[model samples]
Structure formats: structure tokens, C-alpha cells
Target: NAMLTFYEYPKCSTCRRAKAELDDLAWDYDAIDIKKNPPAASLIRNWLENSGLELKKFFNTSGQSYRALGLKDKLHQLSLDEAANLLASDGMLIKRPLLVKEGKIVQIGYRTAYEDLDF
Candidate 1:
């Protein structure tokens, strides 16, 4: 059975690119609309642990919500719980095309996983 869960947003270019690459690479994955079902704060915490990615990696730093909310100035000050809750509150606050397998993150962005992928 396929174990990959691809978290994506329909309008996000990065998500689109990642999906395209996944299709070409023949990766086995199930897609999830992140906005419709943003993972819980606790679950995000679990992924953070499973992925070994820094807290900053989970944030969509370029998103409007991130800037409007002034996360840049205060993100460093927030506790892990606070940051996780904030991400859980809005899917746009998190990055797109998160490749998850069995609750563990495999990749975060298209460029890192796909741009250098074509052989």
C-alpha cells in the first residue's frame, strides 16, 4: 500500500509543480487539500519530530498571512506550542506540498525535491 500523503493547495504553484513531479517520478501518494484539513497542532508537532526539520521549515514565510500577522518579528519569540497552534489555525501559514509518509515528512518544497530531479 502507498504510504505517502501529499499535502497541497490547489492555487499554489509550488504545490502544482510538486504534484507534477510526483506524477512523473511515479511516486505513490495520496493528495490532501491542506486548507480543507490542516493537521492539528499536536500532529504538526509529531511531524516536526518525525521530519527532523526546524520549526522555521514549517512556516510559509512568503505568505500574506505570515506578513500581516507579523510572524517575522515575533516568530522567534513564540513557544513551540504557540507556533504549532498558529499553523493549525491557517493552512496558508504553512508551506505547500509537504510530502508525508506514515506521518513523517519526506520533502518540503518542489525546488529542493524536483528542480534537481530531472536527469
Candidate 2:
């Protein structure tokens, strides 16, 4: 049984790169189209807590969805619940290539984060 779930947006170059790396490593994982099936607030919250990642790190700061909603200025004032709800509202607002292993968030991005993975 595979213990990894990879949440990705196909159009994102970073996601593609991460996917390629996963493939290279011969990892078995379930791929979820994050744009079509966004992560739930509870899951995001759980990842945030378990991963010890800053709330900002979970966001797609450069995505149009994030900018259109004006979250850059608003995030500072929002509570964790509010932020998580917003992120859940649109998959585009969340970052790409979220790698979860055995129910724990193992990686959030393609660079240094991926290098830190325990494999």
C-alpha cells in the first residue's frame, strides 16, 4: 500500500518537476489534482500543525487566485481558521507539489524542501 499522496496542479512547472523527481525515485503515490479537489480545511490545518511550516509557506503567493482575492495584505489579519478556510476555498491559492507521507506532510516545495525529505 502506498503511503504517499501528491497534491499537484498539472500546469505548474514546479509541480511537474516535483512529479518527475518522484518518478525518478520510483515512489508509489496517489496523485490528486489539487485544482479540481482542493484539500480540506482540516487537512490543511493538520499539515500546518504537523509540518511546523509557517502559514505563509502554504500559500501560492504568486498565483493569480491569491492576488485576485487580495490575500497578500489580508493574511496578516486573518486567524488560522480563516486562512485555512480561504485556502480550501480555492486550490489555486494553495502551493503546488505538496507531498504527504503516511498522513504527515513531508514536503511543501520542490527545492530545499524536497532535498530534506527522508525518502
Candidate 3:
């Protein structure tokens, strides 16, 4: 019903397919490059606040940046705000397409994870 904010890399085939699907469905969205420019922590945090899930949902635990940051040890140690701040500073730290529509309906990764939404 609303525009989707899509964070993705144009060069990524997966991203291309997702974009294609959105296009085919005529879904509106904003695309951002996670490599060159990541989202702000405040924005991501807000998304999570509204999203109503654990903070883990918005992070790309398997992404290179997550490992690079040594979050494995810090996962439980860091406060929610601390984790959000760390993830906001880096795009790779977040899962792909860290999305938000209205309020907290934020999600990470791709449609597969959000199959129930049937976007």
C-alpha cells in the first residue's frame, strides 16, 4: 500500500531479481547502495523500534561486516542502543533491504524471509 525503502547493490544479481519482482508488481520503493552508503543508525533504530521484533532481526549476522566488527562476542554484551548504533554506521552490518513502510514494519534480508507479507 505504501512505498518500500529498498537498500541494495545494483550489481548484485539477487538485488536485481528482487527489484525486478518489485517492478513487475509495480511496487514503489527507494533503492540505496549498501556498499557506498549505508543507512543512518537513527533511521535503522527507528525502524526496529516500530518493527516489534528483536534487534537481531535487522542485522545481517552472516554478512562480512558483522564478522569484521567482531560482533559475535558483543552480541549479548551490547545494549540494544549500542548494537543499533554500531549497525547504523555500516551498511554491510545490516541485512539487505533493511526496509520500512509505515511504522515498525521493518525487515532485513529479502522477501524469502518475509514470505508471509506476500509483498
Candidate 4:
């Protein structure tokens, strides 16, 4: 099995909950600080492709960085390629705790699907 990488904000309440759940399940995984250690661009592209979701769907539109970066103003101006490239460089620009297990399970953000995941 592939290793599970949890891209998280250590102080996030939601992340704390996720961590607790992982702990309870005794899930051993790597905890990455997404803001500082963003995933590779190729990996981001692969995740997007597998999930059949648009590139923009990977962003956290309501997060502080989205507003601070003036995404509302920039979104329409950039092409999808430009957007995905930028996001891949900074995980803070991404939705939190993007998960990938095997080549099949590539997901962004916390979701109900997590309920079905094994530790």
C-alpha cells in the first residue's frame, strides 16, 4: 500500500478532528505542513485528473489566502493551466488535507468519503 500523506494545518480545528480520528484508528501517516511543503505539481495534476474534477475545484475559495490573494479578481483572468500551476506551488492555496492512497484514491479536502477509508 502507498503511504498516506496528510497535508494539514496543525492548528486547524477541522484538521485536529481529522487527526483525532486517525489516532483513534491507529493510522500511521506522514503529517505535512501544506503551507510550507506543497505537493509536487505533477502530483497535483494527477490527483485532479483521477478525481475528474476541474482544476479550480482544488482551491479553497473561501480561505484567507483566496481573499488575500484577490482570487475573485484574478480567477477570471488566469487560464486553468496558470491557476493549477500556482496552486501546486503553495498548498495553502489548496483546500486542506488533500489525500492520496494508491493511484486511485486522490481527493481534496475533508469529505464524507473519508468515512469509508481504512486506517
Candidate 5:
């Protein structure tokens, strides 16, 4: 069976819900505490490159950290490297509840996608 590496913040309700679903599905995963051990810039870059998601999608737009840094207005001005570094610099800036398997991000955030998720 394939295993997933799950990145999440314990205090996040969304993360809890997602974890619960994973539990119910009996999915195997290695959980990482995003706040204490945020992913590296290289990892973020790889996920961005392979996730088929725009740079904006990786950001926690509603997060206070995002607002504090004025990322909403500044994101357009950043290069890919700069964006990846910024996200790596702070876990709060990155969107959460991510599941990675075989070096590819399978999911980001919590929702109905779990209904059909495999591995």
C-alpha cells in the first residue's frame, strides 16, 4: 500500500477533519507538524511545479500572516523562487492539509476529493 506524507497544523480544525477522514478510510500517512517543521523551499517548489496549481493556490490567503506581509498585493511581483522562499520561511503562509505521495501532491485543503481518493 502506498503511504502519504501529510503536512498539517494541529490547531487547524480543517486539518483535524481531514485527518479524521483519513483515519476513517484507514489511509496510512506520516504526519508532519507544519508549524514546527515547515517544508523546505525546494519541496514547496517541487509541489508547485507538479501540483498543477497556480502559485496563488498554495498560499493561505485568509491567513493573518499573509495579510501582515501584504502578500495579496505583492504576490504578483514575486518570482517563483521568491514565492517558494516566502512560503518556506513561514508555515502560516502556506495552505494546509496537504497529502503527498511519490513526491507528488495529491491533495491540498479539506473537501470532497477524499470521496474518490486512492492511495
Candidate 6:
């Protein structure tokens, strides 16, 4: 319904397709190089506030960053604010192809086709 934010990695293969699909769509979005510039913790917290899911939903659990940091065990030890800060600072720790509109997260992580997406 409005301009969205697309957080992605340039070298990511999966993002190529998503970007292609997104290119064909009429939706407006601000594309950010997530690895180089992550979002603010407060903005992430806003998305979290509207997302209404566990913080785990936003994490890239299987990613190398998660494994290198041993988040499998450490994740549970972090509080909501701590986890949000980590996600804000460590871009790779977040799920990819993330989309957001204002304070709400339009999407996070891709599966199926981007054609099915709306707003």
C-alpha cells in the first residue's frame, strides 16, 4: 500500500531472484545493503512490536553468523532488547529479503513466489 524497505545482501543468490521479481512489480521500496548498513534497533523494535511473534522468527538461525556466534545456545539467554540489538548490529543474523512498511514488517524470509505478496 506504500513504500517498503527491502533489506538484502548483494552477493546473495536467493536475493537475485527476489530482486528480479521485485523489479517486475510496481510496488515501491527502499533497497538497502543489509551487510553494510543494518537498520536501527528502535526501528527493528517497532517491527517487533507490530509483528506479534517470538524474536526467533526474525533470526537467521541456520546462517553462518548464527552458528559462528553459537546462538543456538546463547539465543535463549538473550532478552528481547538484547536480541533486537544483536539483530540491528549484525545484519547477517537476520532473515533475508526482509520487507517492512512503516512500523509493520510486511515480510521476512522468502519461500514460494514474491508474486503472491501484497503491500
Please give the CA lDDT of all the candidate structures: 0.82, 0.85, 0.69, 0.71, 0.85, 0.81
Please list the residue runs of candidate 4 whose C-alpha ends up more than 4 Å from where it truly belongs after superposition. Answer: 76-80, 103-105
Question: lDDT (0-100) at residue 80 of candidate 5?
Answer: 83
Q: Is candidate 1 or candidate 2 better by TM-score?
A: 2
Model 5 global lDDT (CA atoms, 0 to 1): 0.85
Candidate 4, 73-97: lDDT as tens digits:
8877876567768887777788886
Each model's TM-score?
0.87, 0.91, 0.78, 0.79, 0.92, 0.87
TM match of model 6 to true structure: 0.87
Clashes of 1: 0
Clashes of 2: 0
Residues 30-95, model 3: lDDT tens digits: 777886777777776676666677777777786787888787777878776787788777767777
Better of 3 and 5 by TM-score: 5
Query: For model 5, how many clashes?
Result: 0
- Across 1-119, the per-residue lDDT of candidate 2 in tens digits comes to 58999999878898888888878888899999998998889988788676778889999999999888888889889888888888899899998888888878888878764545767
For the record, the alpha-carbon RMSD of candidate 3 to the native fold, in angstroms, is: 2.9
> Lowest summed lDDT over 10 consecutive residues: which window, candidate 4?
98-107
Q: Where's the lowest-lDDT run of ten residues in candidate 1?
A: 110-119
Question: Compared with the true structure, what per-residue lDDT tens digits does model 6 show for residues 68-115?
Answer: 998888877987788889999889998887877774687787776766
lDDT of 3 at 84: 74
What total of clashing residue pairs does each candidate reach?
0, 0, 2, 0, 0, 0
Weakest 10 consecutive residues, lDDT, candidate 5? 110-119
TM accuracy, model 4: 0.79
Better of 2 and 4 by TM-score: 2
Error of 3 at 17 (Å): 2.5
Q: Candidate 2 lDDT (Cα, whole model)? A: 0.85
Best by TM-score: 5
lDDT of 4 at 18: 76
